[PDB]
Ligand binder design. Structure first.
Ligand SMILES: Cc1ccccc1-c1ccc(S(N)(=O)=O)cc1
Ligand SMILES: [Zn+2]
Length: 257
């Protein structure tokens, strides 16, 4: 059904998911001169020391690394958030060439890729319930530019050949997501949505100002993945990003001056 091609891509999604044309859709362009510095915003608290990664999976739209979210082991707190959000999974969006791939943009600039660390609010008990609430999820977004390699990404890229096609998964234990984070936790924040179906308007977005650098060899491995299942015509998993959506009645706030 839905995907990123001409006949099933972002321009078509509203037919099955009418909230695609809603009031708080993501991603958006971050206009840095219009974002308001908010001195009342707290530093982000990222507590990933006890993270337990479980599996890595090709779901036909990205690859994701899933974590044990049955306890408060890897949590996001502080920043614009009230309460505690458990890390469920991370995944990426990327392009066919380095000049596109990110979902959020910064002054209309596109990065080569964007990492999403997906967390849900423990007050709702499970992610399915959280997706039905306006403060249900917090997604930490991190831009990728191409240059030097990111050592903490290498364990991920080295197993991608084992999950080439839709439906494949593998053990992916003892992965430390702290190795994917930039130095600074300075961020922009705004109320938005999931960027893939169901496009639910349940996300507090926290987008880091500082990109991480990854090497061309690392991104090339992303681009060898397939949208298709094994045995179906090969279609490279590239350009799996939704473009910027209308900001409408929203304010983007900055944690930094
Ligand atoms: C939370 C969720 C539940 C069921 C199906 C898809 C999702 C999901 C999670 C994260 C994103 S994003 N790309 O906004 O980080 C999109 C959908
Ligand atoms: Zn995403």
């Amino acid at each position: 059904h839905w995907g990123y091609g001409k006949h099933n891509g972002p321009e078509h999604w509203h037919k099955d998911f009418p909230i695609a044309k809603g009031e708080r859709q993501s991603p958006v362009d971050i206009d840095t001169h219009t974002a308001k510095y908010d001195p009342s915003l707290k530093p982000l608290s990222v507590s990933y020391d006890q993270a337990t990664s479980l599996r890595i999976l090709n779901n036909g739209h990205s690859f994701q690394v899933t974590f044990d979210d049955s306890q408060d082991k890897a949590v996001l707190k502080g920043g614009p958030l009230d309460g505690t959000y458990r890390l469920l999974q991370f995944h990426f969006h990327w392009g066919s060439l380095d000049g596109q791939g990110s979902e959020h943009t910064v002054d209309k600039k596109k990065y080569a890729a964007e990492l999403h660390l997906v967390h849900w609010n423990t007050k709702y008990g499970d992610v399915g319930k959280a997706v039905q609430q306006p403060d249900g999820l917090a997604v930490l977004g991190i831009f990728l530019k191409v240059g030097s390699a990111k050592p903490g990404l290498q364990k991920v890229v080295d197993v991608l050949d084992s999950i080439k096609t839709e439906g494949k998964s593998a053990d992916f234990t003892n992965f430390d997501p702290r190795g994917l984070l930039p130095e600074s936790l300075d961020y922009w924040t705004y109320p938005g949505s999931l960027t893939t179906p169901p496009l639910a308007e349940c996300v507090t977005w926290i987008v880091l100002k500082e990109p991480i650098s990854v090497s061309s060899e690392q991104v090339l491995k992303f681009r060898k993945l397939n949208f298709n299942g094994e045995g179906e015509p090969e279609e490279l998993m590239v350009d799996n990003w939704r473009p910027a959506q209308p900001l409408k009645n929203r304010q983007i706030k900055a944690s930094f001056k």
